[PDB]
Amino acid sequence: MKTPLTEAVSTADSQGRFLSSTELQIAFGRLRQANAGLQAAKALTDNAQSLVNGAAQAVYNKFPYTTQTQGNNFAADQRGKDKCARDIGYYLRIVTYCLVAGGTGPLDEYLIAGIDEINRTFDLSPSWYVEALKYIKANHGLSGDARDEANSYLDYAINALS
Amino acid sequence: MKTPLTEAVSTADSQGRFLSSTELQIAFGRLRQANAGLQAAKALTDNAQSLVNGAAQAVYNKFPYTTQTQGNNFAADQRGKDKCARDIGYYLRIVTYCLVAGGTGPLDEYLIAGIDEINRTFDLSPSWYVEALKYIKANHGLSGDARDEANSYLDYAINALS
Amino acid sequence: MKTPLTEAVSTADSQGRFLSSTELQIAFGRLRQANAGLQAAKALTDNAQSLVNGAAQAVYNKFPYTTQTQGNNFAADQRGKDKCARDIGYYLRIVTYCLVAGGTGPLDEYLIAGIDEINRTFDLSPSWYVEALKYIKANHGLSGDARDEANSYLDYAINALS
Amino acid sequence: MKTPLTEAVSTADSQGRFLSSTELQIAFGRLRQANAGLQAAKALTDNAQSLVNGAAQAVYNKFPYTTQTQGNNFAADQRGKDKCARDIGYYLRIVTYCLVAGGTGPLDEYLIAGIDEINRTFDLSPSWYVEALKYIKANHGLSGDARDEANSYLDYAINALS
Amino acid sequence: MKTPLTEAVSTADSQGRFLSSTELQIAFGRLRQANAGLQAAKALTDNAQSLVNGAAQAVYNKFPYTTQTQGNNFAADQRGKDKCARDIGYYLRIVTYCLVAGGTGPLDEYLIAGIDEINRTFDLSPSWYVEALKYIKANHGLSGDARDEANSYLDYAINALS
Amino acid sequence: MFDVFTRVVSQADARGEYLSGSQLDALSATVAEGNKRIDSVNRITGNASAIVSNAARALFAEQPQLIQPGGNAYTSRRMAACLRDMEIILRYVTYATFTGDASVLEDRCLNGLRETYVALGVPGASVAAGVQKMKEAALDIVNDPNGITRGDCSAIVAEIAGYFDRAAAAVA
Amino acid sequence: MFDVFTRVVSQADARGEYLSGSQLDALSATVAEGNKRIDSVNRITGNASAIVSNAARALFAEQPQLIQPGGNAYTSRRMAACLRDMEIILRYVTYATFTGDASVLEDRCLNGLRETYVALGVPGASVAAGVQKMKEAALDIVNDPNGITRGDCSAIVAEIAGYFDRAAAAVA
Amino acid sequence: MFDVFTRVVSQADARGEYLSGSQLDALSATVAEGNKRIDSVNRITGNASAIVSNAARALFAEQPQLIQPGGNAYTSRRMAACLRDMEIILRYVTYATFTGDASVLEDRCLNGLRETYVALGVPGASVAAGVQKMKEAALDIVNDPNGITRGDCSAIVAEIAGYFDRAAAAVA
Amino acid sequence: LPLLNYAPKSQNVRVEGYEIGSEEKPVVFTTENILSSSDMDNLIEAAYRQIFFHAFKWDREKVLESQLRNGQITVRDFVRGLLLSNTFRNSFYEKNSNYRFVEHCVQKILGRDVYSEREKIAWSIVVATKGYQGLIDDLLNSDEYLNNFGYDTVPYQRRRNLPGREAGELPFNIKSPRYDAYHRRQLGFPQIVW
Ligand SMILES: *[C@@H](C)[C@H]1/C(=C/c2[nH]c(/C=C3N=C(/C=C4\NC(=O)C(CC)=C4C)C(C)=C\3CCC(=O)O)c(CCC(=O)O)c2C)NC(=O)[C@@H]1C
Ligand SMILES: *[C@@H](C)[C@H]1/C(=C/c2[nH]c(/C=C3N=C(/C=C4\NC(=O)C(CC)=C4C)C(C)=C\3CCC(=O)O)c(CCC(=O)O)c2C)NC(=O)[C@@H]1C
Ligand SMILES: *[C@H](C)[C@H]1/C(=C/c2[nH]c(/C=C3N=C(/C=C4\NC(=O)C(CC)=C4C)C(C)=C\3CCC(=O)O)c(CCC(=O)O)c2C)NC(=O)[C@@H]1C
Ligand SMILES: *[C@H](C)[C@H]1/C(=C/c2[nH]c(/C=C3N=C(/C=C4\NC(=O)C(CC)=C4C)C(C)=C\3CCC(=O)O)c(CCC(=O)O)c2C)NC(=O)[C@@H]1C
Ligand SMILES: *[C@H](C)[C@H]1/C(=C/c2[nH]c(/C=C3N=C(/C=C4\NC(=O)C(CC)=C4C)C(C)=C\3CCC(=O)O)c(CCC(=O)O)c2C)NC(=O)[C@@H]1C
Ligand SMILES: *[C@H](C)[C@H]1/C(=C/c2[nH]c(/C=C3N=C(/C=C4\NC(=O)C(CC)=C4C)C(C)=C\3CCC(=O)O)c(CCC(=O)O)c2C)NC(=O)[C@@H]1C
Ligand SMILES: *[C@H](C)[C@H]1/C(=C/c2[nH]c(/C=C3N=C(/C=C4\NC(=O)C(CC)=C4C)C(C)=C\3CCC(=O)O)c(CCC(=O)O)c2C)NC(=O)[C@@H]1C
Ligand SMILES: *[C@H](C)[C@H]1/C(=C/c2[nH]c(/C=C3N=C(/C=C4\NC(=O)C(CC)=C4C)C(C)=C\3CCC(=O)O)c(CCC(=O)O)c2C)NC(=O)[C@@H]1C
Ligand SMILES: *[C@H](C)[C@H]1/C(=C/c2[nH]c(/C=C3N=C(/C=C4\NC(=O)C(CC)=C4C)C(C)=C\3CCC(=O)O)c(CCC(=O)O)c2C)NC(=O)[C@@H]1C
Ligand SMILES: *[C@H](C)[C@H]1/C(=C/c2[nH]c(/C=C3N=C(/C=C4\NC(=O)C(CC)=C4C)C(C)=C\3CCC(=O)O)c(CCC(=O)O)c2C)NC(=O)[C@@H]1C
Ligand SMILES: *[C@H](C)[C@H]1/C(=C/c2[nH]c(/C=C3N=C(/C=C4\NC(=O)C(CC)=C4C)C(C)=C\3CCC(=O)O)c(CCC(=O)O)c2C)NC(=O)[C@@H]1C
Known part of the structure; x- marks a missing residue:
């Protein structure tokens, strides 16, 4: 699974090298981020039902x-x-x-x-899921690093669908 | 030339991918470190003459x-x-x-x-330089992250010589 | 550009071989088909405006x-x-x-x-084009070999879209 | 074994493709030829002992x-x-x-x-077999498509020997 | 193995060839040399303990x-x-x-x-072993082809260490 | 691979015999069926996307455990791999139909496939169920009397059914 | 590569036009010549070895410089290479005849051929002379009236001649 | 490969479940340990040469048959290969320590390594002995109190010891 | 003689993978990126790892490196040079049967495992008939090599891991050490210890 820690090791391994200051810096960047990520995961999970319900309705209304x-x-x-x-x-x-x-x-x-x-194969429109992802983006109510990281993942999915 | 920023791009380019949060965390990790490194470089630079002459003597004494x-x-x-x-x-x-x-x-x-x-080729003993690198480790008077990053590069060279 | 003649040559060329009975039979197969194909091309060309307008309208009606x-x-x-x-x-x-x-x-x-x-990229639904191709299939009026070949290409596009 | 049907599937498989009208035309080309080929085979088989002894004598006469x-x-x-x-x-x-x-x-x-x-290895002159093959072409009595296909194979073997 | 007979066959095998006069000539080269080498090996072996002891003392004296x-x-x-x-x-x-x-x-x-x-890895100086090889070169007392071949190998090792 | 003709030739050469009169007649019968065979290949191919998707949807409706989280067809890539496998099998069945010999299907599709699924944990029995569903859809399409010159395609339908059964047995 | 059909298609596509009724009639006329085209390919192919070896013999008889010691066709390896080049060109000319388009010849035989020959020191004018000899032998074989249904093959023989001429022009 | 975080994700996805509050809290506790984990990786890395060479020295002193003529670590290449392998195993243990999960160590180093050594004739039991000696030295380096913010690294040290033990078990 | 015929077998590499870049995607070492000296080191090291699994200083080919660094040769040429090197012949050819040597070649050069014994059998005769170089050139000129790695990329083991799985197929340098039981017996190993 692509993460800062697995990519750091993948890089060093592809060079046959012990981890060095470069990879240790990657782990610090992970640590600077992790708590905000865990707080965001928590916030989305607690609100999962209304986000999923609301997102589906946003899609039915748009389409x-x-x-x-x-x-x-x-x-x-x-x-x-x-x-x-x-x-x-x-x-x-x-x-x-x-x-x-x-x-x-x-x-x-x-x-x-x-x-x-x-x-x-199943004749599903990617635009349906983009609209849902935009809804979740506009309704998760995160802030700061949690917002920025969460939005990066939502936009990553939106970009993949378009 | 391995650095966090170039390794991040090198990995993403190999994958044909835009930079993601994983690479952004790599950058945050670099930014967490940069000033300590810069201060460490300054301190080593300003004390360079003393450290070099001290290291040379330490080699002459041990060998x-x-x-x-x-x-x-x-x-x-x-x-x-x-x-x-x-x-x-x-x-x-x-x-x-x-x-x-x-x-x-x-x-x-x-x-x-x-x-x-x-x-x-020139019949130089790696052990001589290892001694020199130990002296620099022991006398640069750094602390905290400056010390840890400096010692890791000094130890990197020592391990390369051993 | 997959056609019976070019594929026959490319196969033989990949094998560094002169054309043999196998490729001659491929040529005869092409000859058995070509006139029906040209007649089918003529029929579709002459009815092109109606087929295209009807196809577009059939899409608007369905969507x-x-x-x-x-x-x-x-x-x-x-x-x-x-x-x-x-x-x-x-x-x-x-x-x-x-x-x-x-x-x-x-x-x-x-x-x-x-x-x-x-x-x-442009958010066009493949189902739209499937609908148009079904209209052309049902309204081109061809029969016999001309129908079979033309439907095979229309089906080929439909399969690619689904 | 190079035959129209195996070649058609071989080509399509290498491209990872379903058979299309190109390959169907190959099948039709095969079907056009097959009955003449089967007839040719029967005529050659029935007269096989005559053709072999006659061919062999032609070699003995020429060498x-x-x-x-x-x-x-x-x-x-x-x-x-x-x-x-x-x-x-x-x-x-x-x-x-x-x-x-x-x-x-x-x-x-x-x-x-x-x-x-x-x-x-066994010091056998190819020209001997070319002479036998020339005889069989001259004395197999086939006509039309059966003659054309049969000679193509006989000439293929002749060309392989010279 | 870099050895005249082994390489002659290795090369012929690599080339899928029967051995030819080139390889037979290599074998004659081997036969011209072999007795001198065998005599050299005997002399070196008979004097083995003295040469080793002298060589180590040479190293200890130089270092x-x-x-x-x-x-x-x-x-x-x-x-x-x-x-x-x-x-x-x-x-x-x-x-x-x-x-x-x-x-x-x-x-x-x-x-x-x-x-x-x-x-x-073990912090052993190549110059130590070079000194010991030079001692052996100086004290094996061989002459003629035995001296030349033996010195080629001692020098080969010296070159490898420098 | 072998086709229907080369399969007979290969057997004859092994015995060092010309094709007997009956063997030639049998191939002449094979040639007479040729158009029906071509039509059947064309019909399955022209409906390939429907056949696979309809069979897949039905398989997952009948076997919901496959698409529940932790199920083998769960996640987009595993779903995609599964749809891909069905299309591959269908494709090779049409190849064997086209050539009139099962060797292409056996050598290039089914060889080692059970071993792959066992190693990956793919439920082979569910794969065979998918293939059966594709078989049933495909044979209906081939036998559709509309828009074609009426005639008896039972022999060709039976051959195709055997190729589908060959694939389903290999994986299950 | 193109064939006679896809050549017309590609020109039509670049202008976004259907094939005109006249374009279609021209291709229909091409279809009617198909049997003669197939015969010409078949006759050249069936005589390829004789065409090459006779032309080679003729070339060397007229240009003994090529085969005397130090000549470009001296030594077995260079002779063999030379004979191979002749057969290669003939093969690709038949490819062009088969498809009814010069693209295969231009793209896959003549692409960089003159450059190769200069880099190697192969005398290009002599290759062209060899090609010309194969042309004359081939056209006589194509036009042979024995053992075939009689007709006017002048349209195809002229096309074949142009493919030989194209090859000869390219090696100089 | 998995790391400490994605190990939990993989289990949750297999269940189709969001991470529970306790799982999120557990990962937060892992994050609070991050600096110690980094310091441990840095300390082993910075002493890797000495760890390998001291461990190898002790191994050949305890098992002199390895380096006597005919032994598996006799001759320069075999000795070099042995030293190399020890460094490889240590390197992958630091990877496992860095990621907080054993998957990389197993997938890229240990899985199959037993068969590797059996095929080569390397005494796997003696490899394990060498791994144990690196473990002893490595843990001492990690626990060294001098020159570092004082604190409790018992949890990370136990994790590292486990990865060594996994490596020692895998080789023999 | 034409190569003995054999059938494939189901393999990851034979089907579309829907790959998305992750830590399990092999790193692409290509000279099409205008690599700096240190980055060229990594590409060279990767090639040594792919072909030798490890190149001691004795094994290394400094002149081939210089020529690759200078653009005289492509990566595929560098790979050929390694396959033709003394280290490869001594480690993987001389210490194995022709059949196992073929397996090593297919694994290292094409990045896949062999289909079966029959594939190994069919190619085992090539060294004897076409010579050692003929075998390497056939594999390096093959559509499979060129389609996957071309001229400018270091080969690698293909589709070893599937997404979401903890482990992939065995790395070939673990699965296929340079020699096996046959040469192990000749060396008189395993050694009894204790
Ligand atoms: C069972 C498969 C069904 C069936 C088939 C069937 N077809 C024919 C005859 C023909 N079918 C074709 C096919 C094609 N012509 C083309 O140009 C192409 C596109 C490239 C194709 C696929 C042809 C050429 C013929 C011959 C002419 C004709 O239309 O009759 C028959 C008749 C018997 C025969 O031997 O040909 C049959 C039975 N018929 C059914 O009822 C089944 C559902
Ligand atoms: C100029 C090329 C010479 C020439 C040719 C010519 N051929 C035909 C007709 C036919 N030729 C064939 C060819 C084949 N039948 C086979 O089965 C195979 C082997 C696989 C081949 C190559 C066929 C099928 C025909 C049609 C049937 C027939 O018996 O004629 C013609 C007549 C035109 C036409 O096709 O109607 C011509 C002109 N004739 C010459 O005089 C030139 C020397
Ligand atoms: C554990 C075996 C030993 C130990 C570790 C320990 N470390 C910290 C705290 C820090 N360590 C670092 C490390 C680095 N800073 C850098 O810039 C780099 C170079 C790239 C490294 C390796 C950092 C950043 C910290 C935090 C700030 C600080 O200086 O303390 C602790 C304290 C707890 C914490 O999590 O921060 C501990 C316990 N301490 C021992 O006594 C063990 C022997
Ligand atoms: C006949 C034109 C002239 C002739 C023939 C002759 N042939 C052999 C020996 C062999 N012939 C073959 C050929 C084949 N074997 C096959 O399997 C096939 C393909 C299906 C072919 C074409 C072989 C392999 C041999 C050698 C092995 C064997 O004994 O079969 C001989 C005897 C050669 C010898 O040295 O024993 C002869 C005499 N000889 C003439 O003079 C005729 C003009
Ligand atoms: C909702 C926005 C719209 C909608 C949805 C819809 N989806 C399906 C069928 C499937 N959906 C998926 C998606 C996934 N499967 C996965 O494993 C993952 C990743 C973890 C995803 C995103 C799949 C694979 C299918 C097909 C298999 C299955 O049924 O589970 C359907 C039914 C389609 C069918 O043919 O059964 C529908 C209706 N439809 C709308 O109109 C909404 C706007
Ligand atoms: C003599 C034993 C018998 C014989 C000979 C003969 N040879 C040819 C033609 C050629 N001979 C060669 C051979 C070589 N050319 C080379 O460059 C070398 C290597 C340096 C060799 C060995 C070649 C290439 C040819 C063809 C081209 C050429 O003629 O130069 C002929 C004439 C063949 C023809 O068809 O013109 C003859 C007569 N013939 C016998 O009957 C003798 C028993
Ligand atoms: C013979 C009539 C003349 C002649 C020929 C000659 N050619 C070569 C060498 C080569 N010829 C080619 C040409 C091609 N190779 C291909 O694959 C294709 C199809 C795309 C063509 C057109 C090439 C590439 C070579 C070089 C590679 C090789 O293996 O030969 C030689 C040999 C030259 C030499 O050995 O130095 C010769 C002799 N020479 C004459 O004198 C005739 C006029
Ligand atoms: C003598 C000139 C100086 C010296 C020697 C010394 N060597 C070692 C340790 C080792 N020596 C070797 C060498 C070889 N092993 C082989 O298999 C072969 C090839 C057949 C050779 C040349 C090796 C591998 C070692 C390490 C493993 C072992 O102990 O056997 C030592 C001890 C080093 C240590 O750390 O234990 C010493 C002392 N030292 C001097 O000061 C002399 C001038
Ligand atoms: C040292 C403590 C012991 C020892 C080691 C030893 N190992 C080998 C040879 C090999 N070791 C490996 C290992 C790996 N390949 C991989 O891909 C991985 C993960 C990245 C590992 C760990 C391999 C493949 C080999 C063979 C190839 C090579 O050596 O380059 C040897 C040498 C055997 C030989 O001659 O090939 C030795 C000596 N031996 C001992 O006696 C110690 C107990
Ligand atoms: C769908 C009905 C069922 C299903 C399928 C499924 N298959 C895989 C994975 C693979 N399938 C193959 C198959 C082949 N390889 C070949 O060479 C051939 C012939 C050309 C075939 C048919 C292979 C090699 C794989 C692995 C490689 C890859 O998947 O890309 C999966 C994925 C398994 C995983 O863990 O990702 C799945 C899901 N699964 C079901 O549940 C259905 C019953
Ligand atoms: C030393 C006396 C002088 C010197 C040398 C120098 N050379 C290079 C770079 C290269 N040297 C070569 C040469 C060869 N490569 C080969 O394969 C062969 C033929 C067998 C030769 C002679 C090459 C190709 C290069 C470029 C590629 C490479 O880096 O190896 C450098 C490096 C320059 C750079 O880093 O770009 C140097 C330093 N330099 C001096 O100042 C001395 C006078």
């Missing part, structure tokens, strides 16, 4: 055809609404993982890698 | 034969003493570079790569 | 939010409708090429390769 | 030293005569396999690969 | 600090003297192997490959 068009890929029945809420919950949860890990690792390994194939 | 034996590789004449003080100066100066760069880059680029070939 | 949502990726204004009709024209025109060439080559070279990146 | 000179590589004794007719039988039989397969595959796999080493 | 300074790498105590006499014995014994083999093969395989790492 009304999704709740009115029949088809396996849409949310015109309870089956589809559940899948959609599930999917949005995945994004939120894995984003909390990135805050804990301090890198896009969890997003890359659990969500982003292969997401294009899924969205093509 | 008396070097000032008693005739030969191009020894310091029995002013020529050899000047070479020896010059070399120790090189080690000290390049270590200050590492403190400025925040990494072993300058030591790898300017001194370490090839030192084995030099010492073997 | 009415496209003609009513403001945004660079939608067809609410005349700008977007022109982009859309142009795009559908591309599909049709390049499909006639495949009929002339006797292979998916023109689709692969001119349209298919990189279409995923385009649609993701 | 009388082969039936007059002693040596393991010649046909002065019945042992050598039987080897020679056997070999010519191999050529004829493998050629009928090519007619069934629709390509040079069987000739490549069973006869051509390694023949240069064999003739060199 | 008196090695018998005076405490440390694992020095011969102040009996342990280090025994290590030293052992090391020198290795050089002499493996040199006799090169005379038997007719090449540097044994020195390369058993001593030279990795000697740089050993001497650096």
